[PDB]
Design a protein around this ligand. Structure first.
Ligand SMILES: N[C@@H](CCC(=O)N[C@@H](CS)C(=O)NCC(=O)O)C(=O)O
Length: 108
């Protein structure tokens, strides 16, 4: 299983960044989520930590830690202000119900 140190590291990165996005360079859904955040929602790049797990030594451990934490297995795995949003579909869902704006206010 994933070490407790890895779990702690991931929890820390999520808490230290207004928006946290576990991603993979070749993931169509990650491109979509980031496009929405940066271009459509105009979120400042400095407010988002984007980790391309497929390009990181600990990428695999981080993805397993995330499953341990929130039960999600896929990327993108998005958090906004420490609150787990989910994947791209989850992000788009919140926009359609008009609930994403209230979450981004403190960040924008
Ligand atoms: N419905 C999900 C789909 C995400 C998805 O399928 N991501 C792929 C990468 S393109 C994935 O995580 N596959 C399993 C893995 O990479 O471990 C979303 O909208 O985020």
């Amino acid at each position: 299983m994933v070490s407790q140190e890895t779990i702690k590291h991931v929890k820390d990165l999520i808490a230290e960044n207004e928006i946290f996005v576990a991603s993979k360079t070749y993931c169509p859904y990650s491109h979509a989520a980031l496009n929405t955040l940066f271009e459509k929602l105009k979120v400042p790049r400095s407010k988002v930590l984007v980790l391309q797990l497929n390009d990181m030594k600990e990428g695999a451990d981080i993805q397993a830690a995330l499953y341990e934490i929130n039960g999600q297995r896929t990327v993108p795995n998005i958090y906004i202000n420490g609150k787990h949003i989910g994947g791209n579909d989850d992000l788009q869902e919140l926009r359609e119900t008009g609930e994403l704006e209230e979450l981004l206010e403190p960040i924008l």
